[PDB]
Design a protein around this ligand. Structure first.
Ligand code: B12
Ligand code: B12
Ligand code: B12
Ligand code: B12
Ligand SMILES: C[C@H]1O[C@@H](n2cnc3c(N)ncnc32)[C@H](O)[C@@H]1O
Ligand SMILES: C[C@H]1O[C@@H](n2cnc3c(N)ncnc32)[C@H](O)[C@@H]1O
Ligand SMILES: C[C@H]1O[C@@H](n2cnc3c(N)ncnc32)[C@H](O)[C@@H]1O
Ligand SMILES: C[C@H]1O[C@@H](n2cnc3c(N)ncnc32)[C@H](O)[C@@H]1O
Lengths: 279, 205, 276, 273
DNA sequence: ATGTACAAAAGCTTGACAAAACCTAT
DNA sequence: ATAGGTTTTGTCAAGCTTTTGTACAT
């Protein structure tokens, strides 16, 4: 019905699936599946989604299959929504690009184009940075993962429309080499029918102004992940780049935007709508 | 309005300079169809990139113009990379030396490897040597390939710096030479064609 | 109708010494108290305690049985209304976003039953009442079909002898067939969805050549079934299933097919052979 | 994914003893190994072995049957033949994989012209020649429609006055309409695809209420058009376009619609006049 | 009749073991 | 394709915690 993720007992499962309670605790120990929510006391609480899942595995085991592969073949097919983030990173860390690409496609179909970016692409990138920061992975491992995820995002960017009309130039301030933030901004713009020209990262301001003038660009959008590149810029440095200038990212703030002469934007969603309305 | 062969280079650049991504994409697909995958890289992708640098150098275009063109052409190459198969087995790690931010050279090397059935893992540019060695060890990588466009990042490296990265270490690009490769403890490779076959023949001969 | 603390004790079986603890531990039931303190259990609680007693005997625990029965609270019911309104004003972006919220909360199967199905039924009724035209319905139906096809592709497709899924000739409603194929795939069955309106000789020929284990037909209208002769479905495949609003047990027997009431027990039925 | 050597023996027909021998003298298949050395075959390998069993039964040796499958770099023109063959054997997984390959080579618009369209035409001709049945066409058409709808949803949907896209009443070929809608979306036009077979009064009423700027009709058959009276399409929307195999300039003039030859010039036509 | 206490029933974790299936090799 | 070594898997046991049915005292 309405709630797949619910609560059951280990006794109810033993009378619904046929598998004894002793087995259910062993498969959770050797494989991790199923992993039901636990009571404050310490007792299990299986969900309805897990109940129908185990009933399917019992068919394969009776048709000629081992529990080690019967579960693995199901975990790949009907994977948990939150296990995709963990799964994708693990696949990347072992150098399995094929497996990683496959897992991403599953996420794309579930969350949708915008959805997969917020709930899969973004959380993985954040965790990768933290994992590196904790010393769990090296720079080379991060590079592999970042290059892969960038390629997926670029694919979505190219799949979006590119309408005619005065372009919007999207890049990052000089000294800023994180480009994925800029790509996200460009993508959300294209999805709303704005001809966002993604330039790549690290663009000198005089050259950016010259290009905006020559192409008659309606706006310039800058993504700042680090704060130091912004602090290095003088007051009003962004004022005359284009008729409208926007600044966002983790490294950007409302106070800093006002000093540089740019409009601060909190979220990517409101950015496309802010182009239609006057400043 | 089909344009002539040598006019595709000129036309693609002009399309990019006017911000016509749609037109540029369409022109590239025509080139890919005419010359095939490897051919379109050599006759279209490479000449345009070289001219873009020269045009910037002469002051005909600014940095922002170059950025747009370079990002576009990188996206097309990454497409072909993903199009190629990725076989199982011990991977080959492909990147650039620390300080080297030109990555398109590395991508080309990784592409030609994949086309020959080699599981080339493209890491991206600018990878620290200790981390590279650690990754190569953990994944049991058969080889490491480095693309050097500038010479200064190589000159900054000490003697033998590349020797123990992986069982085999290859170095190439405009910034790399035979003399410099010997000093760093890497094997020099003149062209991308010979690189995939070099993985079958041991050392010298 | 309200009952005493001893009246419910006989209508359920549980003693009154337990009903007072369930109130002082879990919070159910919560009967009205007289000025003295006497407990008056409502009629909605008597039928509820009779349900838990059946669950507790099945092998459940009071803490879980009561919590499980608290699934009476209906899902975000404004999503059905909202999705339709979004579609009717031509806001595909807004509709897509609303559907994604429904999918994450109730999950894949859940969003079909509580969101996809109710909207489709209301759309037909709204058209029937003259509140919307055919063009409005078309937009909504095409959208919801696209979403379902997306989930279909998201499910895995296992190797082995395929199960062919379609609708009888003359039947153009295809969403019923898609739902059947989706539930099959979710259970590891290689359900090949053909689309609607497949001629019977061609269907039989395909089933034979692909060595299909079964054929599944969705019938929304009854007239396409009534147009078929007796035994028409008998030799299509080793097993033949028929369901939908237009199908019934009596009609299925005549055509030589097995009647299936719900999509849930369809996948379980294909595994183990059913009797006459 | 992950399978057992016992499952393969019951799915492919080849005994477990053979599967370990081909891994020893060819290297294929080379499945992921369990920590204890047990084999875990993937689904891609399962369908692969099922194909090799066909060639061995058709007259081929295992040494060449594997080598021809390993080094099968399919030509650009072999994709159309390959895709249809994959569909005809019921291999949706293989078909989907082949399509993504083509999407990456020709691009979004390219894959439709050189892969999606030629396969659909050949399917109709093959059916017409009696080489395939209706059921086989249905499978292929439903698959390709699903891929196109996926691309449609991946394109942007901008705000502003929508463009309604459908087919005339009696016309059940809808893929033509989807193509038109897709090309419009790729040019930043908010094309609302309605589906096929839409009554004219209802279409006019919807266009009016949503303030639609234009209506686009795809006609594959000519008979649905011939059944319409003169000027039937005139007042549907401020602009009305008509294209497809079943449509022509003479017939468009009679119905009061603008004839469009190619899908490429359709998006551009919506601005200049 | 409100409320606390007590004993039984059921769970959970660490640990181990015998059989079934499997891998490698001559 | 016969044979031996090895990994995987269903089952159970001891020690002990959480939970629930009954009851005990006011
Ligand atoms: C990949 C990566 C890199 C790659 C960049 C690859 C590339 N081509 O983009 C490389 C290897 C180059 C790199 C280098 C460095 N990085 Co780095 N990197 C990352 C990583 C893992 C992900 C970056 C990313 O793109 N994330 C995804 C973005 C989109 O997420 P987000 O910024 O939170 O974005 C959200 C909102 O801010 C909004 N937003 C973003 N952009 C925009 C734009 C607009 C207009 C709007 C409205 C909103 C908006 O959209 C998102 C909505 O959820 C992060 C980890 C992290 N926690 O972010 C570290 C991180 C950003 N890097 C970090 C560091 C330390 C560095 C280096 C200094 C390391 C070094 N010493 O070499 C260098 C700096 C190089 C330079 N000069 O810029 C630190 C930053 C610490 C700090 N802020 O002081 C981080 C946070 C890692 C950590 N320690 O946790 N990095
Ligand atoms: C795009 C670009 C950039 C982009 C890089 C984008 C990216 N993500 O890769 C950015 C903007 C970052 C950039 C920055 C700079 N660049 Co720059 N850039 C270029 C440009 C236009 C193309 C580079 C490219 O990839 N070309 C394509 C490669 C594949 O071609 P190729 O190297 O000739 O490769 C051939 C062979 O060498 C072989 N090969 C290549 N790799 C390998 C690998 C192996 C293993 C093998 C066997 C063979 C091999 O394959 C090819 C076969 O034809 C070039 C122009 C040019 N003439 O190359 C300038 C150029 C390389 N850059 C140049 C300069 C000056 C710079 C900067 C110093 C500018 C500055 N002051 O900021 C910085 C340096 C940054 C750094 N620290 O690395 C100069 C180099 C001058 C010099 N050598 O002294 C060039 C030559 C431009 C010019 N003046 O004509 N650059
Ligand atoms: C969308 C739609 C259409 C679309 C179809 C789009 C498509 N490609 O599928 C189009 C526009 C083509 C259409 C046409 C017609 N339709 Co219509 N349509 C609908 C609508 C709104 C939804 C149909 C749908 O798919 N619903 C979702 C299905 C899945 O729901 P369900 O059948 O109740 O399914 C449940 C169970 O039965 C079970 N089940 C379903 N399939 C299966 C299969 C198996 C194996 C099993 C075990 C169980 C099972 O699963 C579900 C669990 O909740 C319905 C409204 C409605 N009340 O259903 C009208 C409706 C079905 N249509 C109706 C009518 C009148 C018609 C037309 C005759 C109108 C006309 N004159 O042109 C034509 C007939 C065309 C034809 N020859 O088939 C009437 C039917 C009246 C009747 N039964 O006598 C309905 C009921 C509308 C109404 N008046 O309320 N229709
Ligand atoms: C799939 C299919 C079906 C499916 C439809 C599925 C669906 N939901 O769309 C079904 C099974 C329903 C079907 C039924 C029928 N079909 Co049929 N079908 C086909 C098939 C194989 C492909 C159709 C298709 O979409 N092709 C792709 C389209 C996009 O290609 P295209 O029209 O050439 O389009 C190009 C240009 O015209 C342009 N264009 C198209 N639309 C538009 C729109 C605009 C605005 C513009 C500017 C341009 C434009 O874009 C393309 C650029 O290359 C064709 C084969 C074929 N040769 O087309 C037969 C075909 C169209 N069908 C045919 C027949 C005979 C029928 C039936 C009469 C069979 C029957 N007796 O039941 C019925 C008619 C049903 C009806 N009332 O409409 C014949 C038509 C013969 C004729 N013209 O006289 C064909 C040609 C098969 C053959 N014999 O070769 N069909
Ligand atoms: C933000 C990311 O920057 C990368 N990183 C850290 N130091 C360097 C360096 N010297 N060169 C290149 N990348 C680096 C790490 O992998 C980290 O995840
Ligand atoms: C090699 C390429 O480097 C680019 N380039 C030159 N100077 C800078 C800079 N400060 N920042 C970023 N890119 C730069 C030019 O566009 C040239 O084409
Ligand atoms: C069941 C659905 O059929 C649609 N419907 C009703 N009449 C027609 C017709 N002539 N053509 C197409 N669709 C029609 C209505 O929109 C209804 O909702
Ligand atoms: C144009 C397509 O129409 C299909 N086709 C032909 N006759 C019928 C029918 N009676 N019902 C459904 N589809 C049919 C064929 O499969 C052909 O390929």
């Amino acid at each position: 019905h309405m709630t797949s993720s619910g609560v059951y007992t280990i006794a109810e499962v033993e009378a619904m699936t046929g598998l004894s309670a002793e087995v259910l605790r062993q498969w959770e120990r050797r494989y991790g599946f199923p992993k039901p929510r636990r009571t404050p006391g310490g007792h299990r609480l299986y969900s309805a989604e897990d109940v129908e899942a185990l009933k399917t595995i019992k068919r394969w085991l009776e048709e000629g299959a081992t529990p080690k592969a019967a579960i693995r073949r199901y975990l790949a097919q009907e994977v948990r929504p939150e296990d995709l983030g963990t799964g994708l990173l693990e696949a990347l860390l072992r150098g399995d690009l094929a497996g990683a690409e496959a897992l991403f496609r599953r996420g794309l179909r579930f969350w949708g184009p915008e959805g997969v970016l917020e709930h899969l692409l973004l959380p993985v990138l954040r965790e990768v940075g933290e994992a590196w920061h904790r010393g769990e992975i090296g720079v080379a491992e991060e590079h592999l993962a970042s290059t892969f995820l960038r390629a997926r995002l670029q694919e979505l960017l190219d799949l979006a429309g590119f309408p005619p009309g005065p372009p919007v130039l999207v890049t990052t301030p000089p000294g800023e080499r994180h480009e994925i933030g800029a790509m996200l901004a460009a993508y959300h713009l294209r999805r709303k029918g704005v001809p966002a020209l993604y330039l790549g990262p690290d663009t000198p301001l005089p050259d950016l102004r010259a290009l905006a003038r020559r192409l008659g660009a309606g706006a310039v959008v800058l993504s700042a992940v680090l704060s130091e590149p912004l602090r290095a810029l003088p007051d009003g440095a962004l004022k005359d780049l284009a008729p409208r200038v926007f600044l966002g990212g983790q490294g950007a703030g409302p106070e800093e935007a006002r000093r540089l002469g740019a409009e601060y934007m909190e979220d990517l969603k409101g950015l496309a709508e802010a182009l239609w309305l006057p400043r | 309005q089909e344009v002539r062969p040598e006019d595709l280079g000129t036309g693609l650049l002009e399309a990019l300079l006017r911000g016509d991504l749609a037109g540029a994409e369409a022109l590239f697909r025509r080139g890919l169809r005419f010359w095939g995958p490897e051919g379109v890289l050599e006759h279209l992708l490479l000449p345009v990139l070289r001219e873009v640098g020269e045009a910037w150098h002469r002051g005909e275009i600014g940095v922002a113009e170059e950025h747009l063109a370079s990002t576009f052409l990188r996206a097309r190459l990454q497409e072909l990379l993903d199009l190629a198969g990725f076989p199982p087995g011990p991977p080959v790690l492909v990147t650039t030396p620390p300080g080297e931010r030109h990555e398109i050279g590395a991508m080309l090397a990784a592409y030609h490897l994949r086309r020959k059935g080699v599981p080339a893992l493209y890491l991206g540019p600018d990878t620290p040597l200790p981390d590279l060695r650690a990754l190569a060890r953990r994944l049991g990588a058969g080889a490491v390939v480095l693309s050097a466009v500038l010479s200064e990042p190589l000159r900054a490296l000490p003697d033998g710096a590349l020797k123990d990265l992986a069982p085999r270490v290859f170095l190439g690009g405009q910034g790399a030479g035979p003399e410099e490769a010997r000093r760093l403890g890497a094997e020099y490779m003149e062209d991308l064609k010979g690189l995939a076959e070099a993985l079958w023949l041991p050392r010298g001969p």
